Amino acid sequence: TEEPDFTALCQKLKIPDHVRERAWLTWEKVSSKKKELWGICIFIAAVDLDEMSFTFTELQKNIEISVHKFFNLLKEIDTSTKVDNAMSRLLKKYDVLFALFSKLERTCELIYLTQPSSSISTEINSALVLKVSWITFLLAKGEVLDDLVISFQLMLCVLDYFIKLSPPMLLKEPYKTAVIDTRIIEVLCKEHECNIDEVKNVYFKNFIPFMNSLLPEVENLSKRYEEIYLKNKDLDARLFLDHDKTLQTDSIDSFETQR
């Protein structure tokens, strides 16, 4: 009496039999859009039974839903405290990451010149720096670190590092001037209105362990992040770089998530 499309979804997610059964019973309860609700029931069952055979991103890609919409759907279902906590934790992880990534994207736009490609020249964009600094930041955050403010000060340390390795001909003002010493970190702070001392502290006892007590090429760094993501079974934060639908929101969904 399971729908075949439900059975197939469970197969894609490697769901063991007891989890699949519990998820279906959950659906029958809630059942008193189908595929999204099924994914939610699978998540509820997997969390309640301590048997997660998939990552949250994987589940999302299968049912084609954003984090916020998932949250707003789930919150309307009576669930256990365990489930409530799991979902709240994921929501916070996502909101922190989304906030930090938005900031990274905006800051890069202020640091680096942009130029469309033409007959005379190749396109100049910050895709390479975005990718490497984001992944490097992702690795650093999980190493020596949720909690947005300290995370952001750490992101500035990562930004400082990559600015220093950057060609000045690719820098916008005032960053170009700042590379003609402790100058860059000051520019960043005097732009984002941060406590320089606290950022310095994070630099020393957070950032600086990480970069040795741990630059390989990007693909290597990506592979290391992937191992940690697969282990934690939450979100593949690299997908932010692709503006993956699973990680996009709209203003209305976001607002509802807080209500």
Side-chain angles (χ1 to χ4, degrees), residues 1-143 147-180 182-213 215-259:
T1 191
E2 261 176 27
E3 294 197 46
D5 293 339
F6 176 79
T7 304
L9 176 58
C10 284
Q11 301 175 319
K12 294 194 181 45
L13 299 168
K14 310 142 220 186
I15 303 308
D17 297 333
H18 187 53
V19 182
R20 168 179 54 75
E21 293 186 338
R22 285 295 320 145
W24 186 251
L25 288 168
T26 296
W27 162 244
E28 300 195 314
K29 183 277 157 75
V30 173
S31 202
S32 205
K33 205 169 79 54
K34 218 149 60 162
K35 181 161 189 179
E36 290 97 315
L37 286 163
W38 284 346
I40 290 165
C41 294
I42 286 163
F43 173 81
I44 291 167
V47 172
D48 272 339
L49 295 164
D50 275 299
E51 277 293 305
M52 266 218 297
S53 61
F54 54 91
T55 72
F56 197 79
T57 287
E58 187 177 348
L59 174 61
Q60 287 189 86
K61 279 191 170 293
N62 275 280
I63 64 179
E64 301 172 42
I65 197 179
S66 70
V67 179
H68 284 171
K69 285 183 190 294
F70 189 109
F71 182 89
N72 292 145
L73 282 175
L74 176 50
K75 82 181 169 194
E76 292 299 320
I77 303 172
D78 294 318
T79 58
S80 64
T81 297
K82 197 167 176 177
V83 167
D84 292 334
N85 295 169
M87 188 65 233
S88 293
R89 178 206 53 212
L90 272 164
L91 205 216
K92 193 199 179 192
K93 212 176 313 190
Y94 170 72
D95 286 341
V96 166
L97 279 168
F98 180 91
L100 290 163
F101 186 76
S102 307
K103 258 292 172 180
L104 181 60
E105 270 200 319
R106 275 152 201 63
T107 303
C108 284
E109 198 56 6
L110 302 179
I111 294 175
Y112 295 102
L113 298 158
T114 300
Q115 276 286 351
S117 67
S118 71
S119 61
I120 283 170
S121 64
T122 334
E123 202 191 1
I124 287 159
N125 59 49
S126 58
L128 277 178
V129 256
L130 255 191
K131 186 176 184 167
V132 66
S133 63
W134 181 233
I135 301 181
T136 293
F137 172 70
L138 257 9
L139 296 166
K141 168 178 167 63
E143 224 73 302
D147 185 358
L148 190 259
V149 167
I150 280 83
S151 284
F152 177 61
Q153 287 161 346
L154 179 59
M155 148 163 304
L156 293 182
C157 297
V158 180
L159 273 168
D160 184 76
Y161 173 92
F162 289 99
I163 292 166
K164 292 184 166 193
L165 296 183
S166 292
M169 61 160 295
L170 294 178
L171 297 170
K172 269 213 270 279
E173 227 66 56
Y175 303 90
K176 181 145 53 195
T177 289
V179 300
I180 314 279
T182 188
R183 285 186 289 169
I184 284 295
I185 215 152
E186 301 167 1
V187 176
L188 283 166
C189 292
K190 294 181 173 185
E191 296 263 288
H192 287 81
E193 290 165 318
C194 306
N195 186 356
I196 314 166
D197 294 309
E198 288 185 31
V199 172
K200 284 183 185 177
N201 176 252
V202 171
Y203 190 88
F204 276 59
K205 59 178 51 159
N206 287 281
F207 174 73
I208 244 172
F210 167 78
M211 289 265 42
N212 319 253
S213 320
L215 259 23
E217 181 265 354
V218 253
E219 244 38 67
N220 184 291
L221 299 173
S222 186
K223 154 93 297 94
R224 171 75 205 123
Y225 172 76
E226 185 168 295
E227 285 174 359
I228 270 188
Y229 145 69
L230 288 168
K231 181 180 171 209
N232 294 322
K233 291 171 185 171
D234 44 21
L235 304 168
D236 179 7
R238 299 169 302 167
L239 292 164
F240 279 109
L241 296 159
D242 308 320
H243 297 250
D244 196 275
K245 281 176 191 59
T246 238
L247 294 174
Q248 297 173 12
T249 352
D250 74 0
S251 52
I252 293 184
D253 286 335
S254 184
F255 176 96
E256 283 310 311
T257 239
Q258 297 129 10
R259 312 308 141 178

